[PDB]
């Protein structure tokens, strides 16, 4: 029973098969991402050529960051922030957009900055600050075997599988998003861009729905 070569080689072979599966999955994901974006661009162009207007689909995913400290919060927004897992300033979480979650966001508008995250900022968030919740503990991801062991029931095998499930809001978005520990961002590296945070973004402040500028803010904070 030498037991340092045989099962070691078997484990290595199983690892190569898993890596091949992950590689072909990531190739398929990249192809479908670029196909979707070129299809949307071309649909806009065809509507303009026909004389119509292409109304793009409403966003399915928002990223929400808590912007206010923990002192002096009214109880209903405080409860909604706790239920959205924003218990600390500069904490962020992905939210699926439905009527229920939209009413939650309307409740907590003056304490958050939220918007529509892109693939690049989602990927950077998960890569740099990616922590799973494994038996109530915050575990750095750092390897695909963690995601394999904890989300492999719902077909999710790698970090890019988790990213794909987040960005295309799939059937197990709830499970993947709850597996992800809430993101602990820092303050932005270039500042907030405003003299005064606690007005709405429309009024020259920081809270509320900045639609696509959440990518700039989150990348400066990450």
């Amino acid at each position: 029973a030498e037991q340092v070569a045989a099962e070691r080689a078997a484990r290595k072979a199983a690892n190569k098969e898993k890596r091949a599966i992950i590689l072909e999955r990531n190739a398929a994901y990249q192809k479908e991402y670029e196909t979707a974006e070129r299809n949307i661009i071309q649909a806009k162009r065809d509507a303009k050529a026909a004389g119509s207007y292409y109304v793009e689909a409403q966003h399915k995913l928002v990223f929400v960051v808590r912007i206010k400290g923990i002192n002096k919060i009214p109880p209903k927004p405080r409860k909604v922030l706790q239920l959205l897992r924003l218990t600390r300033i500069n904490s962020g979480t992905f939210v699926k957009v439905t009527k229920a979650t939209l009413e939650l966001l309307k409740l907590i508008e003056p304490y958050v900055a939220y918007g529509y995250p892109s693939y690049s900022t989602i990927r950077q968030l998960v890569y740099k600050r990616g922590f799973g919740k494994i038996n109530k503990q915050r575990v750095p991801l750092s390897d695909n075997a963690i995601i394999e062991a904890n989300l492999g029931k719902y077909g999710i095998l790698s970090i890019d599988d988790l990213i794909h499930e987040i960005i295309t809001v799939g059937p197990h978005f709830k499970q993947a998003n709850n597996f992800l520990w809430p993101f602990k961002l820092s303050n932005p590296s270039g500042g907030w861009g405003v003299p005064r945070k606690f007005k709405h973004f429309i009024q020259g402040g920081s809270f509320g729905n900045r639609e696509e500028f959440i990518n700039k803010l989150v990348k400066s904070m990450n």
Partner: protein, 159 residues
Amino acid sequence: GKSHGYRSRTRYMFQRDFRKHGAVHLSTYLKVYKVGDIVDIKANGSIQKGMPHKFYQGKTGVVYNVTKSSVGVIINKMVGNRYLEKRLNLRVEHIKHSKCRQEFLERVKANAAKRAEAKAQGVAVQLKRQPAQPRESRIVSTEGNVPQTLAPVPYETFI
């Protein structure tokens, strides 16, 4: 001094309605209540016997007892920091059947029918309710609908 009698502050609450005074119609007496039914409490001011207290106006409870002219109703009441159950003897003029339960029941019936008809095919039943989803993409034409430009209007007195 202060005044907290049994029907204190119940002026508009126990007022009857506009153009609906007088005797009550016979369907309220012809309704049948069984133990376990979910009922709403709304006091009729013309029937002074078997009235609920003003706290239970607009409350919903479950039938536990049936008598000659009355119904026993169970209400959960918040006292201090917990709930106590309260048993109310109400005449049926202050009682009507609740409609939330029967809507859920007809949803259950349609849900079971859908499940049974899809059991013979296996077609991904999808039996759960979902919230209002964000709307999908669409193309808006300008055939007969060339866009009309609007501008803000100047100030005027208008008196």
